Amino acid sequence: MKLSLVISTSDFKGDLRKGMELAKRVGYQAVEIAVRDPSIVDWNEVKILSEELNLPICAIGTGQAYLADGLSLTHPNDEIRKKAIERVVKHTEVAGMFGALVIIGLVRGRREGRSYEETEELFIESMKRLLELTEHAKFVIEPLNRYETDFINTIDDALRILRKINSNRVGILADTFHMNIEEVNIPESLKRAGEKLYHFHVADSNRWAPGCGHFDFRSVFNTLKEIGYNRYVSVECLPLPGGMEEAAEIAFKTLKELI
Amino acid sequence: HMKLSLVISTSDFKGDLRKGMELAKRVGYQAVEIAVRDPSIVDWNEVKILSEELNLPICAIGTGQAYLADGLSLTHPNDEIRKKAIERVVKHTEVAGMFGALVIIGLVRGRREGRSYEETEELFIESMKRLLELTEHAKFVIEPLNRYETDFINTIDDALRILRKINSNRVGILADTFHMNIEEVNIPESLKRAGEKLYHFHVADSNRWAPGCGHFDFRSVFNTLKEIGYNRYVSVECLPLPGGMEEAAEIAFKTLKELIIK
């Protein structure tokens, strides 16, 4: 089981450097980044930087491609959906340089007045298209709470869709903040996810640094040990309390104590 | 002496109301809670008759749809709309007066809308004081809501700050477990800070399903409620899950009843 830190960067080199150096200084084993459009960033420097600090990049976020450019893998407009798929393909090329996972969060899109079934099938089609367009890329579907989406809110929802995609290149990314709302019994949900649990995000009930809310992290980590989770636990929380740096330190401290 | 109430969903009405109230009575609830967009289009004398026939008081009236449907806000940047919001709420108080019910100030307070928290809060305090000058018996409860529903008054402390500025015992707090599960650091401690200001309470599990179908820690909450002497209403406001409206209300009642009696 490894700890990583999600670092926020502008739409960049400055924020990345600072973030990675902070992660190294605190003790994180890896870092996780999030970029809207990767084609404008020079990843060769990124790799150099990474190699320099001996700090791997575990995953690449794609949420902004949706929040900023409105790209969706279930967009009703086919030309837009095609562009969404092509954008994610570029995310995988970046991920391939570091052997990282590609996060499929809000980029999957919402029902937008359509049935759950039509949305799901369109999503499955796009995912299959991505699996065709890329050879080794690995994707992780992140169930999000009801306020952020009406498509894939729970781990069980994700599992059912994974069975329809039928590929070990697609797994699940569970997030404690979102599970706090959507999951009935978190430990049991994780056990059902089992080996399909590819990545993990941590933040407290208020989305602050772990240890600053009331989320039960102990039970979570006991379950993760029980199922033999040997992948990444990435800190993805608001810069609270006291800012980005303090939050990272606090989160690392409480999580380390439990691992 | 805590009492149990059920929030009943009503279309924007008699049909839904009667079925909801009869359900509450059959399950054992001591009162119901309703929500109406505009009270002016409802014959409330028929409602009172129904309440009397079923011996089911109406402990609180929601006003959230006044915002969600009519866009009325007590902190709206357009003073014209702000006045209308106040006028709409006054009508809710007139209805509340017929039942001795509390008026809930939820989403009707509005959002920051790109403004500072200080200005929004000042506008709100001004609207609440106006509401108090306009009413002689109405009692209001401010309900903190999670970040996704609003950026104005998310925690019990936010409300407490506002209450001290309003300085009126006719305004109190309505805390909701589903919302607290997100916004409050430590729920028991939050409730102790509210103390006597806690006028009404909403209950729903972490997933907003009937209490007992999530992972929210209700035991600790009720221990604190006892410790603080809360003796008013605990109203169930959850999604009709699992199994529907009736099943959810039944499960909710059973969960709460056992917590109380013990």
Report whether A129 belongs to an annotated binding site: no
Binding site per annotation, positions of B for Mn(2+): 143, 176, 202, 237
**Can you give the resolution of this entry in Å?**
2.2
Instruction: Note whether A183 contacts B: Cβ–Cβ < 8 A.
Output: yes
Q: Which residues pair with A32 in a beta bridge?
A: A6, A59
> Angle CA(A170)–CA(A176)–CA(A179) in degrees, nearest 5?
80
Contact B184 A212 (CB under 8 A): no
Give the separation between CA B207 and CA B239, rounded to whole angstroms.
9
Residue of A107, A115, A93 lying closest to A140 (CA atoms):
A107
Q: Which chain A residue shows the shortest CA-CA distance from B149?
A: A147
Residues found in chain B: 262
Which residues make Cβ contacts (< 8 Å) with residue A218, sequence separation at least 6?
A: A258
| CB contact at 8 A, B191 and B227 | no
DSSP state at residue B214: S
Binding site per annotation, positions of B for substrate: 149, 179, 208
Cα B262 versus chain centre, distance: 25
Give the separation between CA A139 and CA A129, rounded to whole angstroms.
13
Residues of chain A with Cβ-Cβ distance to B185 below 8 Å are: 206, 212-214
DSSP state at residue B101: P
- How many Å lie between the alpha carbon of B83 and the closest alpha carbon of chain A? 30
Determine which of A146, A147, A181, A183 to mutate to test the interface with B (most B C-beta atoms within 10 Å): A181
Residue of A252, A186, A194, A254 lying closest to A228 (CA atoms):
A194
Residues of chain B with Cβ-Cβ distance to A206 below 8 Å are: 182-185
Q: B149 exposed, middle or buried (CB, 10 Å; 0-12, 13-18, 19+)?
A: middle
DSSP string of B161-208, one letter each residue: HHHHHH--TTEEEEEEHHHHHHH-SSHHHHHHHHGGGEEEEEE--TTS
Indicate if B237 belongs to the active site.
yes
> Angle CA(A125)–CA(A126)–CA(A131) in degrees, nearest 5?
95
Query: Which of A 131-170 lie inside 8 A of B, CB atoms?
Result: 145, 147-148
Residue recorded with tokens 């089981």: A1
Report whether A207 belongs to an annotated binding site: yes
Instruction: Note whether B176 contacts A: Cβ–Cβ < 8 A.
Output: no
Continuous H helices in chain A: 13-26, 43-53, 64-67, 78-98, 116-133, 155-165, 176-182, 186-193, 217-226, 244-258
CB atoms within 10 A of CB B92: 27
Domain count, chain A: 1
Give the separation between CA B134 and CA B137, rounded to whole angstroms.
10
Give the separation between CA A137 and CA A95, rounded to whole angstroms.
7
What is the H or E stretch that residue A252 is in? helix A244-258
| CB contact at 8 A, B211 and B178 | no
Contact A181 B183 (CB under 8 A): no
Give the separation between CA B247 and CA B236, rounded to whole angstroms.
13
Domain that holds residue B151: 1-262
Both structure tokens of B147 = 């970040």
* CATH number of the domain that residue A69 is part of: 3.20.20.150
Give the separation between CA A152 and CA A84, rounded to whole angstroms.
18
First to last CA, chain A: 8
Instruction: Note whether A220 contacts B: Cβ–Cβ < 8 A.
Output: no
Contact A214 B183 (CB under 8 A): no
